Each structure stands twice: as structure tokens, then as C-alpha cells.
Design brief:
This is part of a larger assembly, with four copies of chain A (428 residues). Chain A is built from 13 helices and 16 strands. Chain A has 428 residues and is of the alpha/beta class.
Chain lengths: 428, 428, 428, 428
């Protein structure tokens, strides 16, 4: 009865109108699990696309679906639904390639998640309880995308994302309200300036600001209009520089997004420029402040800001234990952005999280630009007491589905629920 | 064991960052059902709001939640989960008011959908099967929002919504694909013209066009760019004038949105403007072409187009069977937009669908501006073989969630699935 | 357990002493379903007879029984009992012929009904609930055969049937009493005139009246003697002209049944003659007023009486979606008599009902001259909220079995039960 | 779980359009049984009627229903469904009267049959198996009504019923076939003679014959027309004189039905008239040949025919064991007609059957004029291996329902089924 009897996949659409896949796992006892995959370098997990540029611009996932039904299914059917680690290792070996390019990183993960949710269903326990055990209590402090730049905007701004973090909320429920009220207070402000209030992929705004400072100072304005502070409760701010977007040789070219008068900074001036922003604004976290390959710049940045600011490695570590292990030894950062589909399996996802923990690094569970109605990353955030999460702005179900799921978790936990707020950053 | 042993509601957020509610129904047997609620003149069902702008600007829903947990619970617990009608009728009687303003239309619908999904879970049958019986095979022809105007835009366009319909698609699966491909093709075109590609509430665009015509032809331009004809396969176009937004006395003032040089038309001149558009562009449906109180305008409008174009009454009927019965009697329209939470219960919802069917009217299950990850309206569309559905554009998950569920329903049906396409309009 | 494990058929007798068949379906879980077939052109379903004029005058059904046990059984066993549509389509494809002449329309239906009743048994829900879902509430307004003519009588009367309809009863239970009391009041009247009170196939009388008017006016006499009215509550009257019985060329020859002085009417005079009856008597419905092939006569009849009288197509549509689809486009009638075995399956029966609905036509669930102790058509009448039913007079279990089953349904529904009475005719 | 947890009765109609009642018994285990009741001097069980001729001319049964739901229910609920005798004895004691006139014989029998069928459902065994044990194999030899006289006709015939018996049939299946074929053959003959072919309450005919003999010979004429001998296979004939209908003083006045020239016979002359018929026609059984109070006539009648012809006491015994015991002691007859509702309970029914058997009397389970779709008397006939049954003609379903059930019973038995035919009369 506990044995997996059925593994089926189908093609569906993500929050961007692009094809993805989902896997449904059945046990003979009736336990059901459905897993959906978000959208997805040379040393990271690769999703399998059809390449037929006449169907969905070549973004179809029928090849990946076939691999689940016609290959992986025959390999997984027979396993106990609860043997997660064994099932994941079975798919990794089945693929052969390091990047899961033969079967597809999306085909592999879909099954990985469905099996876990089917197991949690079989044991009649919450998903986070099954993944993390009995000691899951910490609701994550959210970094919420609010303003976009760089590739995700036409505004003269270099940084890709600007987020707000309710570090001083008594609980997650209140923190979610705080972020929401500021989102609406900002929308009101944007309308006043006659700017656009329509949202992008993550549900955040991307208005034509005068520049980076105009953008950050406008955020600070919406935070205060909502009736909050700026650093105390705070609400504090965070960056997703995505500096690799405008990195050239060995120079951080800002003219790429910010215009003709923009500055071209070296690794040393890039560190100084980040230090000026931190000193002038209530900034608590900075993601990909340095190029993915600028290791020397990452180390020098950690020495000069790592003790008082969170330095998240996204494109720098690409959810890779090899890249992270070197980050720890080199002291390149102090935080890692965990993207599930960027590694392939849930097992690999939890080994990356633990490694970051044992090193003093924080693990920030991440979403993708192309999301679904799935909210598994929320259960993962609480399952491991990550204390932090990154799952988008406050105006899209592809984002709100995760905040909703965290509300249920915080509701299920009751008095056991924990919100660390500013204390989520033990890496400081 | 089929007895409802617990009814519980909590506060959550919709796709716009505004509070809503979800209800979870439990039976002694262990069956579970969760029903979330979307956002929602004087003769309709009203949602209960807290009115405390210290929380979500007074958009809190802790009052309606309390009503479910403390009042509706004592009433529903004990009922058989399968007695849908008796349960909905009990909530209506419990409330005591026509507009469900005492307990809240949102609180009553929450329990209404939760009980249904819990009953489908208990019987181990698909929701659409439980809702409509064995004869559920028709996959709806989607009217997909793609361009917004009026109050949802800054462009000089009076019409509120513009939609594309894959009437010539062989299946829903290919229809959805066509919509997505036209949506991506249109996004490209907008960037080439230097227009905003950011999406609105429904996942559609609101570019600054030259006017109404420019918008329609840019759609046809994208339809053909995707490799589809314009009216045969089709793709066809649809309107949501929402003319009650720019109606005055007794005139349709277009200057409200289309600048100072706009044409103020009378009822007779309004019908004429619509007829010109129909003959010039491949338009197949028009929603709220006349004021919600312009019955004489609706009657004359149905006389000159009711045999060749679908006329959808949204604000004209507000999912009110008393209004619909009058529209059917006077021949005021030939289609009604069905908004679930606008009428309170599922029972009342299916009575309106049936009354419309028996009159030769089509019933178009609709979404709301504030949506959730729920996808019950997709099961409602298949359960009633309505043949049509209006659930947003091809981006946000609050819209895609419904499209994904329709794909699962079409997948489950297999050889029994049916896509009527153009034949969906039996009212023509 | 939910899988069908046994499909068995046997020969039994109908309400006329003629052979028919019944199918019993078993699931491994113990769910049981029994289906019996009523007695049964060139484009309609054909029942399979043995043709051995030495056994039951060649009306045996052993060939049909064999086809269920030795052919259909092997094809159906394995299917989930709940997959009605798939099972029906499997039998249609198995037969091959359009009219189901190879396996037999009676062999196919028997399984169709047994499977559905076995499924309703498996889910532990009422049959009408399983067939129609949760929104089944409308008890049908009955047209009750009371006086016979034409082929079913020796009296000088042309019309085949004369029925009464309790359009003004508060509920079905009262409507059934009304019809009964008038039946007994008529029996008393017939005895007074020294006429025969023995009953025919449908349990109605067929006395030697002076003619059509003497027959109708005698009915009006029994209605009033019972303490009712004639049009209000009403009780109103209906016809089953079966005009094809006395149709010749292009003339409606009344001398065929009414005698030497009878009138021979053209299509135009036939319409006028029906208009005179409607104007002089409280007539609300007329079945087969025109020949099955007289399409032109049907259209002209609908233009002149279709707005104020129900025009039922029996031999005109022969429960055929192709004939009905043309009836809608041509506007040939406004109602269809649904005979289950005349089409073959339950799926086809519900597609015919829905088509009639979406066109403004009413669907009147019909019985056959040779009935059984089965009462499935009653559950079908409520399953689809048809609002009307035709299942015989008030003095035979082959008829009373259906009225009894409707009493149970109305009793099961409770306060949810609905009786439209005169409002059953939404086609007016 | 075998405990009765609910007993519920409702009002319904019989085969004549007159009110009756049915009872539904439920157990905690989910077992269900429904027992319907047929219609029913001073020493018998009487049905309870409402006496309100504003409803069904005072034939309402809402009083007996109320007695079941409000009085009998409180008494029976809690009993084990398998304790039939204890339950029937409790209802008799509850009523307190011999004629069951307080609660109603109809109300008590309803629960009596419902409990039995519910117990057979719980044990998952055929009703006849539950009622009689393992040794139930004998399929009854049917006495089939075919021609009616006396009070049930206008023809000059004193005898109330005429019947055909397939004594020489190899099985019940072929016996039923023979009866039907003679019934259809007779219908033909009647139309050739210009006589009415409309059926009565029992599905038989009542043609205007020349007299008694003409009727018997017309039957033999049809028997031979069907290709059967007359007395060998047989077909044989039977009578139901109901001589208590035309009895006066101390004379059998035949002028009551057979015109002015009829022969008024004494008891001695009555026996003589019957003996002549027996020697002239292939008659095998005679019911109520003597007045119900003409004991001296019954004794002398059994002396001169009791060894060669079956004498059935219907009104003579009125299913009264006190009457039967006297008839057995005096040798007044050699067969008793068993009417279930005429004695109230199933327990009392089987005691009369056994008392008759042990005396060498045959027990003929009988139907009533007002029947239902129920077919319990067929299971009673097989359960007791009675070898005979009287349940109507070969048309109406109120009669055919019992024949169909006997076919199912004979089908279930297979090689164990036994048709005694002529050997059924062990009293000869």
C-alpha cells in the first residue's frame, strides 16, 4: 500500500505563459502527491526543453514529460513512497550527466517533489513536518521584491531588484500585512508621480525613476507613509544587484542600464559603492553584489561588509555544493540563495541548506521568475528553519500562493510558531 | 463518517495583496475540502469587510472569518457533506438578508465551495463530476483578456477589456497554446513600438495606443504574427465595454477616456458604433455594450446584433436571477456573465446557469480582479458543459491556475473530452 | 473494488406479456445494479429480436441476452463502474452500426442503465444524484394518459392519446393525487354511460365515445367532478395525435379512425383544426400533431401555436440529435419526447436533453407501451430538471412504479423539492 | 451493526391508483429493506384508512404511516434485523387487537416484510433463502387469471375468475412462456369475435360471452391455438367461483349475473353443477365453490371431488388458522389461498402455510386486486416449496413483476430448481 504504483507527468503553463511540467505520484493505498516545476551557467542543473520553436517558442516540455512517464516511472515504481533519498539518488544515477541534461532537471525535480508530498499525504502529516521532522517552527522573514531595475526595467537603474524586509514584525502574519500596506502605499505614490503601477514577473513595480537613489528613496517614502519606520521594525531594504548583468574587462559598467553619465567601477570601487549605499540607507542584505566569477571581489566585499550586511550568493553559487564549499573556505560570502530546480532534487537541496548552516551561512529559499500555483518552497523554508525566504512581491498568485501557504503553516503551528525578524540573520 | 465534523476559516490574501478568506471543511471520515474566495449595485451579494484601515486599509476579513468559525460552523457541522443544496439553503436562511450582508457573501461562499470539494474528496470523484454528474465533457472556449482600457488604463480607449478567442482550435489544449503564443507575440510587438509590457490585475496589457481601433488591429497584427488567421481558427476578438462606466443625461460620454474630441453617443448611436466594429473586425462577443440600466438600449441592441454576436450581461444582470429572468423575457441579451461570489452560493450559481441555458442564453463562468490559487470555476465550467469561460490572460498564476486545471480535466476525460470552439455559441 | 467484475443478462417479460431483457452489473466491492429495458423508422435505435415466430411470436430476446453475456461483457468487464461515458462509447463502437442493430439497442441500453445504477450504488448516492449531480430538485409535471384513440381504440377518434396535466398543484405529491381522483371520477362517469372501464397498455380508458369532442368534453367533466377547475390548476389537457398514423397524398385522413363523415385535411387545414381545439379547450401540449416527414407543416404549426402551446416531437425526432438539431434550426417544434431505448445509451439520452435545453426546447422523458417494474426514467426526469414526464395513466404498476419512484425522490429532497407546474413549459 | 436503527414508512399508490404504504428498514451496518403493501368478513386483518374523502376518497393511508413512524418505530428500532418472529410478535402485542385494526394490518405487514428483506440484505442471501433456509428449490405451478366474470364483468357469467395452469411444463420458464402465448392467442380470438381486449385489475380479460361454457371452451380454443393440448401439458383450467357473491335462502342464485333464466341451485345442486364442469372440461382446481358459511356444503363438496380436484378456500378461510384448523378437522376442503396482508405478519403467514402442509392441504400464495411493484410473494412461494402460486395474468407489471422474480429465482437455483407441474398437487 505504501509502495508507489503510479508516476505520471503532464504539460502545463507557468506564471509567464510558458510551458512547464507537473508530476503526480500515486500509492496503492491512495496517497496522492502533485509536484509542479518553476522556470529554469555550465555547472548547474539544466531543464529539458523541446526546442521546437514552432510550439511555445521552443519552450515545450513534452520531452521532459515523456522522460517521466516512459523512463523515470518504470524506475521509481516499486519504491516505498517514504524513501526520498533513495529515489532521488536513483534519478541522479539514471540520468548520468552532472547537470541532469539527459532526462532533464525539470523532469527529475517534478517527481522529487510529488513523491515527498505523496509521502506526507500517506503519513497524514504536514509537508514541512515530513521534510524537517518535529522541530519545525521558524516562519521565514521575507525579502519582498518591490521595485525592479536592470534587465527587468526600462528605468535608468542598474540593480535588478529592490526588496523590503519586515525585520521588526512580531510574527509572520503581521510582517505580511506590513509588506502589503507598503506595497499599496507605494502604488499610491507611483500614481501621484504619474508613473506606471502595472507589475512585472514577480508582481513588483518597475517605474521610470531618476536612478537608483530615486528608487530607494521612494521605497523609503512608501514605508513611512504606511506608518512604519525605516530600520527598526523596520522596514529594512535589500538588493539583488545581479552585477553579472552589467559586468565587463574586469569592470562593472553601469552605463549599461543607467545611461551615458553612469559610472564604470572596478572591483574595488564596486565594494566602496556598496558600502556607501549601506551607510546611507537601511540596507541589510545584498545579493550578487559581485560578478559570478569575481571571487577576489567577493572576498574583499565580505571583509568590508560581511560582518554587518548579508551577502547572498545566487549566480555565484548556483545552488551548487561545490561552489558553496569553496565560498566557505574562501570566505566569499555569508549567505546562499537556494533554488530547488537549479540543483535538481530535494535531497540535494537539503544538503546545500545544511552545509550553509554548518558554515554560519544563511539559506534563503528562492522562487523563480516563472512560478506556478505550487507553494512547496514555503514548507521547505519552515522545514529547515531557514528563517528567510524570497518568493516575490505582493500582487500575484504565483507569489501570494507562497505567502498564503506560510499563513497556513503559522496557523497550524499555533503558539509554537517562531518569527526571528532581525534575528534571522545569524550570519552577522 | 460522511458527516461534517469541522468547518474552519482563516484570513489570507488575493492576487492584489488584499485580504480574503478560505474555508476548510472536514468530515469524520477524514475527507477534506478547501474553498478560497475571490474579491467582490444594490441588488447583489456583498462581501463583509472589517472597516479597520489600521489593517489592510479596512479590507480585513476577520469578521467574515469569525462568522464562519462561530456561527456558520454550529449550523453546518452535522450535515452530510453531500447535501449541498440543504447546506447552502441553511446559510441563506441563517444570514436572513438578501445580499448576504450580515454573515458576508464571502463567508457563505467559502463554506459553499469547501463543502463541495470535501464531498468530491469523500466520494473520491473529480469536483466537476460531483458538481454536474456523469455527462461532463465540454471544455470551455476561453475568452482571454489581452488588452485593457477605460478605468484599467491611461490610454485613450473607452472599452475596459479586449479579448481573444481560439474558436477554431481542435481542443482546449491547442486553444490555450494559441492564446499564449499570441500573448507572447503581442508582447514583442509592444516593445518594438516602445510601449509598456507590464501586466495588470488580469495579466493583460494596457499600452498607450492611439485609440480603440489601433488596439483591435494591433491584436489582429499579433494574431497573424503567431501564424493564425483572424476569424476562422480564429482567432476572434471580444469586448467588455463596461459602458456603465462612461454613461450619463442618457448619453454614452466617450470623452471620459478618449480625450476632449471623443464622440458623445446616444443609445441609438451606441448600437451603431458597436455594429461598425463588428463589421470591420472579427468580433464575436460584446460585454456590457449598454448601460446596466439602459434596458431599452439592450433590447434594441439584441435586435440588431443578437443573432450574429454574443451580448454578455455582466453589470446588467449582476448574476441576479430576477434580472436575468427579465432580460430573458424582454429579450434584452443572449448571454450572462456568471460571477460565483456575486451570488453567494454554488446552488444559486447553478440555478442561474440552468435558467440561462433553458432560455438559449450562454453562461460564462467568470473570474474576479482579486483572485486566488483556487480553480473551482474551471470545474464549474466543465460540470455544466457551459462551453465558455472568462478567467483572465496568459501570465499571472491567479489566471493560469484555472487554465492548468482545465488541462487536467481535459486529460482525465481522454476520448470523452469535447471542445465545441465556435459551436459553443448555441445562442447564435 | 470499483472495477466491474460481472455483467449478466436474462430474458424477462414486459407489461404486455412480451419478452424483454435485463442486465445485472456487479463490482468486486459488492455494488449491484440492475437495468430493465422497455419495448422498442430507419434512423433510430433497433432492438434485437429472435425472429423465431414459434417462441413468443418471434419476440424472444435470447440473441440480445447472448450479446450481453458473450460479447459486451468481455468488453465492459475491467472498466471502472463510474466511467459511464466511456462505457457507452465502448458499446457504440463495438456494435458498429448507426442503429445498434448488430448487438441490439436493447442489449446495449440494459448494460447502460445497470452500470449507472451500480455506480450510484457504489457511491451510496441516489440514482438521480449520480446522473445529474448536486443540483437536482425539479419534480416533473406529469402528462397523464387518460383516454385513448386511433390505433389504441375502437372508438371513432383520430388522436392516439388524451392526457391531463396538474399544472397548478403546489407539489408533485398533490399533483399525483389530483390526477388519480380525476381518473376515478372518470371511471365513475364511464360506468354511468354504460361504457367500458377496463384499461389498455398505459392504464388509460378507451371507451366508445361519439368522437374527439365527446372524449375531451368527458375528460373536462371528470376533472370538474373531482372538484378542480379546467385551466387554472388546472387541470389542463394534452394531445398525442400520432398524426403519422392517419397521414396519406399529403393529406391527414380522419376517415381512417373517425368514420365515413370524417374530414380529410391538408397540412394547412390540419394546423387550423389544431388551433380550433386549442381555442375551444384548455390544451397546453400537442405531440406529433404533424406527420413525421411533414417538416413544412411542423414549421407552419410552430409559427401559429408554438408561442402559446407546447409542440412535442416524438416520431418527428425519434430521440435523434440529428433530427432535433434540424428541428431547432428550422424551428420545427419547441419540445422533444425523450425515449431512452430509442437512442440506445444514457449518454446519448443526456446529450439530447441538453441540446433541447440550450435551444429553448423542453425535454419530456417518455415511457413505452411495454414497460417493466423499472423506474429509471423518473430519476432521469429529476436528474436533469426536465420539469416534465410522460409515464402513463393511473392504474398499472408498469406506470405507477414511476409515480411511486417520484414520490420517494420528492420525499428524499425535502424542502429542496421543486414543482414548477405551469412553469415547466419555459418554451412558451 | 445488525441492529435496526431506523424504520420509516411513506404513502404511495397501488396498481389501481389507490393509496397504500411502503416501509423501509435500516440497520446500523447499512443494510436496507423495503416492504410495500397490497390492498386489503369480521374475522380477518383490516387495513387502516384515513377516512378523509377530500383525499383519495378516504382511501388515504397517512394514519397507518404515522403509526409506523411514531409508534412501531420506537418499538422495533433496537431489535436485531434477524429476529423476525420476535419483531412480528411485538407488533401484534403492540396493536392489542386481533384484527390489527388499531395500528393497521397494512402498517404491521409493511414493517414485517421490510425487516425480512433488510435481514436478507444484511446476510447477503436471497430473500427466499432467508425465509425458508437451504432447502428452497420448488418453483410454483402458476394459476394464471385469463377470463373474469361475476362482479368483475358485464357478461352473463357467475364465476368470478377463470385460470390456466401449465401443469405439463418442464420448467417454470417454459410454463410462463406457455401462459403468455395462450394469453396472446386468446387476445387475437377476441378481436376476431369483436369482443373487448382491454384488461382488468389482474391483467385478464372480461369479454361479453354467451355464458360460462362459452368462456371455458374459448379458453380451450386458445390453448389449442397456441399449439398446446388441453389437460396433458396441459393446459388445464381453474375456477374461482366466489359463490359467496351470489349466495342467498340457502340457495346459489345464478340470476344475479346470468340473467333472468339462470338456474337457482341448492347446495346439493351446486356440487352437481361443479361436477359436470369437471367431467366436461379439463378443470383441476376450484376456489370458493361454496359459500364461505356453507360448511356443510364444503364438506359434501370435498367428499365428491376432494380426491380428484383441488378445492381452494379463500373467503372460506380468509387466511385464518382458526378457520383452517376447523376445515382440516371437518375435511371441508383440501387447499387454502394464502393472502399475506389478510393475516398481518410474515410469521403468521408461514404458520398457516405449515399448518396446511402438515394436513395435506396445499398453500397457494395469492396476490390482491391492488398490487405494487413488490414481488415478495414469489420468494414466499419458493421459500416454502409451496408448489403453487396465484399472482395474476400475463400483462400488467403488478402481475408480471412476480413472474420476473420467479425467473430470477429459478435462474439462481440452476440445476437445483424444480418444477413439479402436476405433481404440485400432493393433496390429490
Amino acid at each position: 500500500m505504501s509502495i508507489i504504483t503510479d508516476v505520471y507527468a503532464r504539460e502545463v503553463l507557468d506564471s509567464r505563459g510558458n510551458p512547464t511540467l507537473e508530476v503526480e505520484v500515486y500509492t496503492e493505498s491512495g496517497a496522492f502527491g502533485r509536484g509542479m516545476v518553476p522556470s529554469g551557467g555550465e555547472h548547474e542543473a539544466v531543464e529539458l526543453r523541446d526546442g521546437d520553436k514552432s510550439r511555445y517558442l521552443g519552450l515545450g516540455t513534452q520531452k521532459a514529460v515523456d522522460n517521466v512517464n516512459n523512463v523515470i516511472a518504470d524506475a521509481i515504481i516499486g519504491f516505498d513512497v517514504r524513501d526520498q533519498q533513495a529515489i532521488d539518488r536513483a534519478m541522479i544515477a539514471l540520468d548520468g550527466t552532472p547537470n541532469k541534461g539527459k532526462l532533464g532537471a525539470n523532469a527529475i525535480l517534478g517527481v522529487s517533489i510529488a513523491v515527498a508530498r505523496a509521502a506526507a499525504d500517506y503519513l497524514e502529516v504536514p509537508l514541512y513536518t515530513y521534510l524537517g521532522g518535529f522541530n519545525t517552527k521558524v516562519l521565514p522573514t521575507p525579502m519582498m521584491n518591490i521595485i525592479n531595475g536592470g534587465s527587468h526595467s526600462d528605468a535608468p537603474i542598474a540593480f535588478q531588484e529592490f526588496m523590503i524586509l519586515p525585520v521588526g514584525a512580531p510574527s509572520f502574519k503581521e510582517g505580511l500585512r506590513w509588506g502589503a500596506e507598503v506595497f499599496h502605499a507605494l502604488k499610491k505614490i507611483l500614481k501621484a508621480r504619474g508613473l506606471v503601477t502595472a507589475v512585472g514577473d514577480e508582481g513588483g513595480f518597475a517605474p521610470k525613476f531618476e536612478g537608483t537613489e530615486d528608487g530607494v528613496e521612494t521605497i523609503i517614502e512608501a514605508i513611512e507613509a504606511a506608518g512604519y519606520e525605516a530600520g527598526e521594525n523596520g522596514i529594512m531594504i535589500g538588493f539583488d544587484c545581479a552585477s553579472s548583468e552589467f559586468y565587463d574587462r574586469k569592470v562593472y559598467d553601469y552605463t549599461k542600464f543607467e545611461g551615458e553619465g553612469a559610472a564604470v567601477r572596478t572591483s574595488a570601487e564596486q565594494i566602496d559603492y556598496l558600502e556607501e549605499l549601506v551607510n546611507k540607507y537601511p540596507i541589510i542584505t545584498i545579493e550578487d553584489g559581485m560578478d559570478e566569477n569575481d571571487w577576489d571581489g567577493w572576498k574583499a566585499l565580505t571583509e568590508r561588509l560581511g560582518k554587518r550586511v548579508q551577502l547572498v550568493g545566487d549566480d555565484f553559487f548556483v545552488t551548487n555544493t561545490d561552489y558553496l564549499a569553496r565560498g566557505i573556505k574562501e570566505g566569499a560570502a555569508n549567505s546562499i540563495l537556494i533554488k530547488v530546480n537549479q540543483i535538481g532534487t530535494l535531497t540535494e537541496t537539503f544538503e546545500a541548506i545544511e552545509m550553509a548552516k554548518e558554515a554560519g551561512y544563511t539559506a534563503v529559499v528562492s522562487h523563480r521568475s516563472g512560478e506556478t500555483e505550487d507553494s512547496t518552497i514555503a514548507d521547505i523554508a519552515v522545514a529547515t528553519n531557514a528563517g528567510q525566504i524570497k518568493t516575490g512581491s505582493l500582487s500575484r498568485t504565483d507569489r501570494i500562493a507562497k505567502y498564503n501557504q506560510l499563513l497556513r503553516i503559522e496557523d497550524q503551528l499555533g503558539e509554537v510558531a517562531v518569527y526571528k525578524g532581525l534575528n534571522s540573520f545569524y550570519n552577522l
